[PDB]
């Protein structure tokens, strides 16, 4: 059970750890988060109490290194840092744990929510979408643009999601214009799966990452990518049965976790109505259709 200690909490802040969150007051004796489950990637996220525009965080894996948070009063944010001295890190964590200055990752035994949201998400693949190669953890925030958004500005601070464009030479074989436009199977199976992602696991990994960045940061480009990757599958007549069954599971848990009060900002009416009621896969997403009709019937 790994630990992300904090030097201190000098500014009032809402701290998220995966799907959980808590409020820390200005100069509260808060020295971080313990009992973080090994075996999954995690996200620690922040929204300042005095300025809700400051919404940002770090994807990390405690298997990769010893990570801590320290507030930087110059840049005005909680920074993740790697501690290379193992024995200093263990000694600091031990003191904070003894003084009970840490909150415990509040995982219910029965509850597979986080595994279900991150099944296909790998820290090595996140570092390819978010490249700051000197760090083992990845910073994301609410404002970060995607490579596709930057084609339609700073190339270093960008989310390198795979560009999906239904009206692109990549999506449409010369001579198969109608076929490829009405049935996205070529674009999904040959261009995206065989060509770029190599396998459905990598495709689901980016889809899941895009959803999580949309939900935790309100990252608009991430929300566009999540919907484009759903629509590319739902708009294909030919999809392996294992991929349809897994997508139904993936979306079910995403729609389950989505806080109701954010459904107006995080769900695209056109895409969901098309995917569930008009697409080739309209009858293939049984679990997703049922939770969507029961939780968000207004949208549909």
């Amino acid at each position: 059970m790994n630990t992300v200690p904090f030097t201190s909490a000098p500014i009032e802040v809402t701290i998220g750890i995966d799907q959980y969150s808590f409020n820390v007051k200005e100069n509260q004796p808060f020295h971080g988060i313990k009992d973080i489950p090994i075996g999954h990637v995690h996200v620690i996220h922040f929204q300042h109490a005095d300025n809700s525009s400051m919404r940002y965080g770090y994807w990390f894996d405690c298997r990769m290194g010893n990570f801590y948070i320290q507030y930087d009063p110059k840049d005005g944010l909680y920074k993740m840092m790697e501690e290379r001295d193992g024995a200093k890190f263990e000694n600091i964590v031990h003191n904070f744990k003894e003084r009970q200055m840490m909150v415990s990752y509040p995982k219910i035994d029965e509850d597979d929510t986080w595994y279900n949201l991150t099944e296909f998400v790998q820290m090595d693949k996140i570092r390819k979408i978010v490249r700051k190669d000197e760090n083992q953890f990845s910073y994301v925030d609410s404002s970060m643009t995607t490579v596709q958004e930057n084609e339609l500005s700073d190339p270093a601070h960008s989310l390198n999601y795979t560009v999906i464009n239904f009206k692109s030479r990549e999506a449409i074989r010369p001579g198969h214009e109608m076929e490829d436009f009405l049935d996205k199977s070529y674009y999904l199976n040959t261009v995206m799966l065989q060509g770029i992602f190599k396998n459905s696991s990598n495709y689901f990994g980016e889809l899941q990452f895009a959803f999580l960045n949309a939900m935790f940061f309100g990252n608009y480009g991430s929300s566009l990518q999540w919907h484009a990757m759903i629509e590319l599958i739902c708009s294909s007549a030919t999809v392996p049965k294992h991929m349809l069954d897994k997508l139904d599971e993936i979306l079910y848990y995403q729609i389950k976790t989505l806080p109701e009060q954010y459904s107006d900002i995080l769900l695209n009416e056109r895409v969901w109505n098309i995917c569930l009621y008009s697409s080739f896969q309209k009858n293939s997403l049984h679990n997703t259709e049922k939770i969507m009709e029961n939780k968000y019937p207004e949208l549909l």
């Binding site: 009206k167 449409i172 436009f181 009405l182």
Partner: protein, 254 residues
Amino acid sequence: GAMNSSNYAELFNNDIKLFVDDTNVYRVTVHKTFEGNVATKAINGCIFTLNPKTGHLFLKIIHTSVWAGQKRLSQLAKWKTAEEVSALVRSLPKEEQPKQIIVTRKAMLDPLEVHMLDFPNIAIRPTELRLPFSAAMSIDKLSDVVMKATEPQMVLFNIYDDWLDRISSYTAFSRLTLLLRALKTNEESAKMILLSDPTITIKSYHLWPSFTDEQWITIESQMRDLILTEYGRKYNVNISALTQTEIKDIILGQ
């Protein structure tokens, strides 16, 4: 853009453009079968591809053989239209390729955009203009070449005949749209106006009669009267009681 707020003058500038109308591509007669079901029989169609500045009409004749053994024909027709317009563009020298293609129906936008991905600098635009190009098949010589075709064929026309020798493109297009609107509204009455005077003929190489400038004014007047008469018949409106502002609005409003 589109043509929402509208500048009509853009049609007559020196940027090559084409209107594409797909309303006559897929044409059927609906009939009863022996068992008393309903079936369709396709008849020959055409793509109406017009340069409004020059009058150049690229009439691609769509032979019924295109449809043989195909499904979802109303959908396919859009894509076949887009396939043929893209083939026409690719066939033209670079200096004759259009800068814009204006589709008369919004359903043609995606098909044409997808067929023209190789031409990112050619704008594909809709129009808020309600253009009467469906009535192309009311021009006898165009209907005749379409119905006689035994195979896919392209035929070239100047839909303005020799009018540009005497009038501007703006005025030629206005005359064409008035004539096509009248043929669309009351084909029989429109043809009687055009063809009833024994002394006025259609040149072998023309589509419309050889009217003097003064005769075109009379014909134009008679066509505007036909359109207003049919609007009164349709809506049960006493037209004899309307004003010129009222009358002017009803024709262009159309």
